[PDB]
Scaffold this motif. Structure first.
Motif, mmCIF file in Angstrom:
data_model
loop_
_atom_site.group_PDB
_atom_site.id
_atom_site.type_symbol
_atom_site.label_atom_id
_atom_site.label_comp_id
_atom_site.label_asym_id
_atom_site.label_seq_id
_atom_site.Cartn_x
_atom_site.Cartn_y
_atom_site.Cartn_z
ATOM 1 N N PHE B 1 0.787 -1.147 -0.085
ATOM 2 C CA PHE B 1 -0.168 0.097 0.082
ATOM 3 C C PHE B 1 0.812 1.246 -0.029
ATOM 4 C CE2 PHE B 1 -3.454 -2.824 1.565
ATOM 5 C CZ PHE B 1 -4.381 -2.624 0.816
ATOM 6 N N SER B 2 2.074 1.198 -0.432
ATOM 7 C CA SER B 2 3.063 2.291 -0.389
ATOM 8 C C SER B 2 2.625 3.500 -1.139
ATOM 9 C CB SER B 2 4.574 1.816 -0.729
ATOM 10 O OG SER B 2 5.362 3.116 -0.550
ATOM 11 N N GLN B 3 1.700 3.280 -2.199
ATOM 12 C CA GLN B 3 1.366 4.320 -2.945
ATOM 13 C C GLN B 3 0.266 5.274 -2.730
ATOM 14 O OE1 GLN B 3 3.753 4.575 -6.387
ATOM 15 N NE2 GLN B 3 4.482 3.812 -4.270
ATOM 16 N N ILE B 4 -0.515 4.931 -1.734
ATOM 17 C CA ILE B 4 -1.705 5.472 -1.231
ATOM 18 C C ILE B 4 -1.713 6.070 0.066
ATOM 19 C CG2 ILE B 4 -4.289 5.397 -1.245
ATOM 20 C CD1 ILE B 4 -4.253 2.773 -2.867
ATOM 21 N N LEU B 5 -0.971 5.377 1.229
ATOM 22 C CA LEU B 5 -0.543 5.967 2.417
ATOM 23 C C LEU B 5 0.080 7.111 2.156
ATOM 24 C CD1 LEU B 5 0.459 2.566 4.325
ATOM 25 C CD2 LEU B 5 -1.591 3.918 4.601
ATOM 26 N N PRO B 6 0.117 8.094 3.309
ATOM 27 C CA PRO B 6 0.699 9.225 3.522
ATOM 28 C C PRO B 6 2.172 9.167 3.623
ATOM 29 C CG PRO B 6 -0.524 9.048 5.429
ATOM 30 C CD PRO B 6 -1.079 8.123 4.342
ATOM 31 N N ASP B 7 3.020 9.916 2.938
ATOM 32 C CA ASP B 7 4.540 9.608 2.926
ATOM 33 C C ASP B 7 5.070 10.417 4.258
ATOM 34 O OD1 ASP B 7 7.124 8.775 2.501
ATOM 35 O OD2 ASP B 7 7.136 9.686 0.571
ATOM 36 N N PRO B 8 5.606 9.914 5.162
ATOM 37 C CA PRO B 8 6.228 10.856 6.270
ATOM 38 C C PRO B 8 7.453 11.740 5.804
ATOM 39 C CG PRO B 8 6.033 8.376 7.053
ATOM 40 C CD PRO B 8 5.761 8.525 5.550
ATOM 41 N N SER B 9 8.254 11.383 4.858
ATOM 42 C CA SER B 9 9.357 12.136 4.309
ATOM 43 C C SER B 9 8.903 13.530 3.632
ATOM 44 C CB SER B 9 10.011 11.345 3.407
ATOM 45 O OG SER B 9 11.662 11.897 3.173
ATOM 46 N N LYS B 10 7.826 13.584 3.179
ATOM 47 C CA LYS B 10 7.059 14.855 2.646
ATOM 48 C C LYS B 10 7.288 15.975 3.626
ATOM 49 C CE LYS B 10 5.928 14.629 -1.187
ATOM 50 N NZ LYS B 10 6.406 14.724 -2.635
ATOM 51 N N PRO B 11 7.560 17.063 3.486
ATOM 52 C CA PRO B 11 7.143 18.007 4.460
ATOM 53 C C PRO B 11 5.705 18.247 4.675
ATOM 54 C CG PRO B 11 8.005 19.285 2.507
ATOM 55 C CD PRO B 11 8.115 17.705 2.311
ATOM 56 N N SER B 12 4.785 18.117 3.736
ATOM 57 C CA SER B 12 3.552 18.164 3.956
ATOM 58 C C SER B 12 2.790 16.546 4.153
ATOM 59 C CB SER B 12 2.746 18.898 3.011
ATOM 60 O OG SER B 12 2.760 18.369 1.534
ATOM 61 N N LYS B 13 1.758 16.604 4.832
ATOM 62 C CA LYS B 13 0.965 15.188 5.053
ATOM 63 C C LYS B 13 0.113 15.004 3.838
ATOM 64 C CE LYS B 13 2.250 15.723 9.840
ATOM 65 N NZ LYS B 13 2.951 16.971 10.086
ATOM 66 N N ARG B 14 0.922 14.224 2.712
ATOM 67 C CA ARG B 14 -0.014 14.125 1.450
ATOM 68 C C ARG B 14 0.622 12.474 1.040
ATOM 69 N NH1 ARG B 14 -0.627 19.739 -0.265
ATOM 70 N NH2 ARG B 14 0.741 19.709 -1.762
ATOM 71 N N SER B 15 0.086 12.301 -0.217
ATOM 72 C CA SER B 15 0.220 11.103 -0.688
ATOM 73 C C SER B 15 0.731 11.083 -2.206
ATOM 74 C CB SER B 15 -0.498 10.072 -0.508
ATOM 75 O OG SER B 15 -1.924 10.303 -1.194
ATOM 76 N N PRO B 16 1.558 10.189 -2.703
ATOM 77 C CA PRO B 16 1.931 10.526 -4.199
ATOM 78 C C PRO B 16 0.897 10.723 -5.143
ATOM 79 C CG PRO B 16 3.472 8.831 -3.118
ATOM 80 C CD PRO B 16 2.239 9.200 -2.058
ATOM 81 N N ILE B 17 -0.352 9.885 -4.904
ATOM 82 C CA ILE B 17 -1.331 10.139 -6.002
ATOM 83 C C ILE B 17 -1.888 11.624 -5.852
ATOM 84 C CG2 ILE B 17 -3.495 9.258 -6.916
ATOM 85 C CD1 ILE B 17 -0.917 7.640 -7.507
ATOM 86 N N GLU B 18 -2.218 11.999 -4.752
ATOM 87 C CA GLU B 18 -2.585 13.248 -4.435
ATOM 88 C C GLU B 18 -1.713 14.328 -4.862
ATOM 89 O OE1 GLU B 18 -3.552 13.296 -0.250
ATOM 90 O OE2 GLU B 18 -4.418 11.567 -0.545
ATOM 91 N N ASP B 19 -0.365 14.282 -4.702
ATOM 92 C CA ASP B 19 0.790 14.979 -5.073
ATOM 93 C C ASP B 19 0.714 15.067 -6.590
ATOM 94 O OD1 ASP B 19 2.740 16.676 -5.197
ATOM 95 O OD2 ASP B 19 4.292 15.126 -5.044
ATOM 96 N N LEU B 20 0.598 14.006 -7.327
ATOM 97 C CA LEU B 20 0.406 13.989 -8.727
ATOM 98 C C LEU B 20 -0.896 14.586 -9.270
ATOM 99 C CD1 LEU B 20 1.791 11.591 -11.316
ATOM 100 C CD2 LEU B 20 -0.560 12.452 -11.674
ATOM 101 N N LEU B 21 -1.921 14.742 -8.615
ATOM 102 C CA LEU B 21 -3.149 15.158 -8.751
ATOM 103 C C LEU B 21 -3.183 16.769 -8.715
ATOM 104 C CD1 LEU B 21 -6.466 13.293 -7.703
ATOM 105 C CD2 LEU B 21 -5.561 14.152 -10.055
ATOM 106 N N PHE B 22 -2.479 17.261 -7.579
ATOM 107 C CA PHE B 22 -2.639 18.616 -7.198
ATOM 108 C C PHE B 22 -1.901 19.648 -8.439
ATOM 109 C CE2 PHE B 22 -4.734 18.333 -3.327
ATOM 110 C CZ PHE B 22 -4.418 19.590 -2.919
ATOM 111 N N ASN B 23 -0.833 19.152 -9.260
ATOM 112 C CA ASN B 23 -0.241 19.639 -10.233
ATOM 113 C C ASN B 23 -0.815 19.529 -11.701
ATOM 114 O OD1 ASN B 23 1.423 20.683 -8.377
ATOM 115 N ND2 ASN B 23 3.332 19.670 -9.063
#
Ligand SMILES: *[C@@H]1O[C@H](CO)[C@@H](O[C@@H]2O[C@H](CO)[C@@H](O)[C@H](O)[C@H]2NC(C)=O)[C@H](O)[C@H]1NC(C)=O
Ligand SMILES: *[C@@H]1O[C@H](CO)[C@@H](O)[C@H](O)[C@H]1NC(C)=O
Lengths: 50, 100
Positions: B1-23
């Motif tokens: 599930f590493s692609q949907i759970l939030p990623d701690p390393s990011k400075p903001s509490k988000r997840s890779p799919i959401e990050d790709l969506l926002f841009n």
């Protein structure tokens, strides 16, 4: 205020998108000036029951 | 599930799919951190936002920002990954994933 827009020898006024005067030229000094409004928006009240 | 759970390393509490969506969507200008006198200086080339502002048409900020929305999502998904479908009715009950 003072702006740095270029002007033609026979041009007199500048007009914005809203079709209202914004930039003028001094009739006796021959320098370009710009006009902007001064007020702003409104307020709001937070209150418990009377 | 590493692609949907939030990623701690990011400075903001988000997840890779959401990050790709926002841009991928061009949101309109906003921020409202400071507005008075902006289009007087280097923005003498007037932008559309302050031209709209000078005529009395305004917009307002929403009640919920993005951060707490991401928090709700990271709550629901964590609920549905480790407790089956019981937490929608009563107390949470844990079940191993393969049996679920
Ligand atoms: C879960 O899947 C993700 C994506 O399929 C894996 O993350 C990738 O791992 C590869 C290594 O094979 C890297 O080259 C990619 O850069 C990784 N991408 C991302 C977005 O992390 C992840 O390793 C998998 N987890 C496990 C435990 O295998
Ligand atoms: C009269 O107008 C001329 C033309 O610009 C200017 O040079 C001069 O200084 C003005 N004098 C007075 C007294 O306004």
């Amino acid at each position: 205020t003072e702006s740095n827009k270029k002007f033609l020898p026979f041009q007199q006024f500048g007009r914005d998108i809203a079709d209202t005067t914004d930039a003028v030229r001094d009739p006796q000094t021959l320098e370009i000036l710009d006009i902007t409004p001064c007020s702003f928006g409104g307020v709001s009240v937070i209150t418990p029951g009377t | 599930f590493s692609q949907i759970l939030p990623d701690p390393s990011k400075p903001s509490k988000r997840s890779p799919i959401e990050d790709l969506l926002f841009n991928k969507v061009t949101l309109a200008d906003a921020g409202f951190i400071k507005q008075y006198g902006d289009c007087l200086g280097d923005i003498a080339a007037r932008d559309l936002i302050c031209a709209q502002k000078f005529k009395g048409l305004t917009v307002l900020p929403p009640l919920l920002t993005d951060e707490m929305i991401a928090q709700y999502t990271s709550a629901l998904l964590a609920g549905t990954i480790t407790s089956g479908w019981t937490f929608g009715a009563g107390p949470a009950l844990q079940i191993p994933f393969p049996m679920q």
